[PDB]
């Protein structure tokens, strides 16, 4: 199959969370959330993430409460039956930009921006892919490529023709922690935040793993020793034959 069809192979960036003993970088998760809210949320939903899961991860209980209340959700009908709204609470799920699939396509040339809740696990390449796609838009497509109207070229995307334009540009976000918001810094951040969205158990899973692997390793070594001891009588056993007379 032609390279253009498979797509350019994403290289291996040194993510701080790569490695058996490494946790996510929560500061990066925090920043990433801002990039998602200020840039991505305009077209991408995050349906599977609940406000409460942000508490103690990237924001305080108070901060998340304020964020959730800026949005309205359908409340239970009043004493008379007429519908009524209500501010958001921690139990709710982060709302999306569109009310349905049809309106989502209408606002995007007919394309459907997928939900980003599992995006990192739903693509070969994971973080390396998402980052590479975001920072890999060339100013001009390679010579000879007949790019369809309304499309964009990106080498990392299969077939090269993607319906999402470049959306990250230097300093389009004012990082609350002071960090220089370069396009690569922002891509590096959202991706980390998107990895957490898909694998919230990450940090904990690796801690439990370290305990599990130490016990089982020890048990394995110990069993060998016990087995050899229990077998020593059979192993060193010796025979002698003395032909019986007729």
């Amino acid at each position: 199959m032609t390279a253009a069809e498979h797509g350019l192979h994403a290289p291996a960036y040194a993510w701080s969370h790569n490695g058996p003993f490494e946790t996510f970088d929560h500061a990066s998760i925090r920043r990433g959330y801002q990039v998602y809210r200020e840039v991505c949320a305009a077209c991408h939903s995050l349906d599977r993430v609940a406000w409460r899961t942000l508490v103690g991860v990237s924001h305080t209980n108070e901060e998340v409460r304020n964020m959730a209340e800026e949005f309205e959700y359908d409340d239970e009908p009043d004493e008379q039956g007429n519908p009524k709204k209500r501010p958001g609470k921690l139990s709710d799920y982060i709302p999306g930009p569109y009310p349905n699939e049809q309106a989502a396509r209408a606002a995007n040339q007919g394309a459907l921006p997928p939900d980003l809740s599992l995006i990192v696990k739903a693509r070969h390449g994971g973080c390396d892919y998402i980052f590479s796609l975001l920072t890999g838009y060339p100013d001009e497509p390679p010579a000879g490529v007949a790019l369809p109207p309304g499309s964009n070229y990106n080498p990392y995307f299969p077939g090269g023709s993607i319906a999402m334009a470049r959306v990250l540009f230097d300093d389009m976000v004012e990082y609350e922690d002071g960090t220089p918001a370069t396009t690569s810094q922002m891509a590096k951040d959202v991706t980390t935040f998107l990895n957490w969205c898909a694998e919230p158990e990450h940090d904990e899973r690796k801690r439990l793993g370290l305990k599990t692997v130490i016990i089982l390793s020890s048990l394995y070594l110990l069993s060998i020793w016990v087995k050899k001891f229990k077998w020593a009588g059979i192993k060193t056993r010796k025979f002698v034959f003395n032909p019986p007379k007729p």
Binding site: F239, F241, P243, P244
Partner: protein
């Protein structure tokens, strides 16, 4: 495959000087690569015994050969479990690797084949 059949083919090759000089040297090389001799076994010790022909054969085998087969088999299992081979001076020599059970196996097969033949004989008037 019956031993009667193995013998037919093997004997035909063994008699003709054309094949006899071509094959035997290959067969001898095969037997050494098999390595059963390094475990103190004779080829006949390796024959699968779970069938009537082999049970009849082992039953007719004289006492002294039987006790010897027993010692060879036990000795083999013990060496195998230790993941070693016997010291070279204990290996079965080619002169020793004789088909001692074969004559009993062939006798039983003929007896068996005859019965099969007789139980099914047709009659022409």
């Amino acid at each position: 495959q019956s031993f009667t059949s193995i013998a037919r083919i093997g004997d035909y090759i063994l008699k003709s000087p054309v094949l006899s000089k071509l094959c035997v040297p290959v067969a001898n090389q095969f037997i050494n690569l098999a390595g059963y001799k390094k475990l103190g076994l004779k080829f006949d010790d390796l024959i699968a015994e779970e069938n009537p022909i082999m049970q009849t054969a082992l039953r007719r085998l004289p006492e002294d050969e039987s006790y010897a087969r027993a010692y060879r088999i036990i000795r083999a299992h013990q060496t195998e479990l230790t993941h070693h081979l016997l010291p070279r001076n204990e290996w079965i020599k080619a002169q020793e690797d004789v088909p001692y059970l074969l004559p009993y196996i062939l006798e039983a097969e003929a007896a068996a084949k005859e019965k099969d033949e007789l139980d099914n004989i047709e009659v022409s008037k």
